[PDB]
Amino acid sequence: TLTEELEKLEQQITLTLQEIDSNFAKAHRIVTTSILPLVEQYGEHSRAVWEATKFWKQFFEASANV
Amino acid sequence: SYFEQQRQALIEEIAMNFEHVLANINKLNRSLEAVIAVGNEFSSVEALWSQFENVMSWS
């Protein structure tokens, strides 16, 4: 009973450790999956928006510069 | 000198209408100057949209 529970909980600990590793790696996969290309696309479209603002900003600069 | 008397009276009549028109144009010229004085807000505005049309032939 004593050594029984010892080995049992020891195996539970090892299993739980492997489970933690699995969840951890799952989060790792999620980030490495497509989050980086997603934000790259976001920044790309944002860059396009800056090209949009590149025109009208000139007029505001002109207003400041008379 | 009858026609000379007519000449004198008629040149004076001409002078009357002449000066009359002078006074008219003077009050009018004041209106003109006032109009343009109110209208001089088109320097920077015109320059702004001049830059607009300039950048149309830029990109």
3-state SS string over chain A? CHHHHHHHHHHHHHHHHHHHHHHHHHHHHHHHHHHHHHHHHHHHHHHHHHHHHHHHHHHHHHHHCC
Asked if A66 lies within 8 A of B52 by C-beta distance, the reply is no
Asked if A59 lies within 8 A of B48 by C-beta distance, the reply is yes
Which residue in chain A is spatially nearest to B58 when comparing CA positions?
A55
Cβ atoms within 10 Å, residue A29: 9
Resolution expressed in Å: 4.5
* Amino acid letter for position A49: V
Closest Cα in chain A, distance from residue B51 (Å): 8
* Interface residue of A53, A56, A59, A60 to substitute, partner B, most B CBs within 10 Å: A59
DSSP-assigned states of every residue in B4-20: HHHHHHHHHHHHHHHHH
Cβ–Cβ under 8 Å, residues A65 and B54? no
PDB experimental method: cryo-EM
Asked if A59 lies within 8 A of B51 by C-beta distance, the reply is yes
